N, CA, C and O atoms as a DFTB+ gen file, in Angstrom:
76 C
 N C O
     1  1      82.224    -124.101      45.462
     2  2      82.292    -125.426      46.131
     3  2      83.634    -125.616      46.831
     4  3      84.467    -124.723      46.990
     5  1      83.730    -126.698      47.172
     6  2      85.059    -127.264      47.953
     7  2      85.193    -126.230      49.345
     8  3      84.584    -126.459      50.390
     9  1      86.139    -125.017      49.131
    10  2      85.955    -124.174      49.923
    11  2      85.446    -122.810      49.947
    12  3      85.435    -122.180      48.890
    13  1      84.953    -122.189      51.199
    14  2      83.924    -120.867      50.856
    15  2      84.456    -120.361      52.046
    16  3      84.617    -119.170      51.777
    17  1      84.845    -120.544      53.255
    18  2      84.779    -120.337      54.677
    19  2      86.217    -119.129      54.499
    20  3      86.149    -117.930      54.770
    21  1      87.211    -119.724      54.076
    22  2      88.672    -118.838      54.566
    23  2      88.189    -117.763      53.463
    24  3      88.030    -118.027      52.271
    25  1      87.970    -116.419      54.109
    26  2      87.952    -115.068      53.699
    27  2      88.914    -114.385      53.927
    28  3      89.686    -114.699      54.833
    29  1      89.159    -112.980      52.953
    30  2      89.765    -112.186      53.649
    31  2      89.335    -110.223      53.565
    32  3      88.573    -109.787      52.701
    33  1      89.679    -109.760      54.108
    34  2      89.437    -108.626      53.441
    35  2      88.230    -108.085      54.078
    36  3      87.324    -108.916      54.160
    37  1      87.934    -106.774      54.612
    38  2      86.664    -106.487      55.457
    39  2      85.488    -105.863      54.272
    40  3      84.625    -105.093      54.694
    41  1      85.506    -106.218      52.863
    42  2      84.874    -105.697      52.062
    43  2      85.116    -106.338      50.855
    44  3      86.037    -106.042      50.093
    45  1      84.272    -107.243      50.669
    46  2      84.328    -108.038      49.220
    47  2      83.228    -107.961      48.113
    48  3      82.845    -109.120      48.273
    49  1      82.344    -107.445      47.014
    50  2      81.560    -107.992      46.152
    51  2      80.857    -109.234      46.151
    52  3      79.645    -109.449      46.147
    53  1      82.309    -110.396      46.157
    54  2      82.358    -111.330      45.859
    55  2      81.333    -112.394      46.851
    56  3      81.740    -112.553      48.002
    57  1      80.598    -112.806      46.629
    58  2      79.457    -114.229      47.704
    59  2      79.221    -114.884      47.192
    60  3      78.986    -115.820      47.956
    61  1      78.982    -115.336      45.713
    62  2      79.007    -116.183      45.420
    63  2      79.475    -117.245      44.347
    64  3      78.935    -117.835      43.411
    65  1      80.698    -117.213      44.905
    66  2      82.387    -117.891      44.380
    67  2      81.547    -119.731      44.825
    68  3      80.870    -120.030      45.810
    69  1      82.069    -120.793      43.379
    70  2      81.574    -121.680      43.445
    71  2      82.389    -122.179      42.163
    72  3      82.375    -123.400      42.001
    73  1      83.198    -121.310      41.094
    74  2      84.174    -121.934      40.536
    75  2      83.544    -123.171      39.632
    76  3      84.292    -123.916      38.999
């Protein structure tokens, strides 16, 4: 939640961060 948009990195696991 809150924020999802600012990424970094051309290769993450990570999609679904919601904390």
């Amino acid at each position: 939640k809150f924020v999802i948009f600012l990424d970094v990195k051309h290769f993450s696991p990570e999609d679904l961060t919601v904390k």
